[PDB]
Amino acid sequence: IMDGLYINNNIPKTKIVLESKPDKNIFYSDNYQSISQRAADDNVKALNLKTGKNEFPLDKDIKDYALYFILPKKTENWKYLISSDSVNEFTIKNDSSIEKD
Fold this sequence. Notes:
This is Type VI lipoprotein IgE-like C-terminal domain-containing protein. Residues 17-94 form the Type VI lipoprotein IgE-like C-terminal domain. It is classed as unknown function. Keywords: unknown function, type SIX secretion system, lipoprotein. The protein is mainly β. It has one domain (1-101). It has helices at 24-29, 32-36, and strands at residues 4-9, 15-20, 44-48, 52-56, 64-70, 79-83, 87-92, 98-100. Strands 4-1-7-8 form a 4-stranded mixed β-sheet, with no helix packed on it. 21% of the residues are buried.
């Protein structure tokens, strides 16, 4: 169990949204309001990141997720499609940039 989601967070009060089995078009269209309106869907999960290291498991029975970063601020790379068969690592830097490592 190496595969998963690993986030090194340097910006306090940052949040993520994970959506399982996402529609890729909707994903590319999405902005902050559109994904916000889906917070209540069964397949959508908002989480508050702690400062420093965060790890979340990804269900291997689901291939694909959409991951969205919600800073407390705007960043270029705020959204990614990630697979559960992979080690997905990210760092939210002090300057608010997000590196996928």
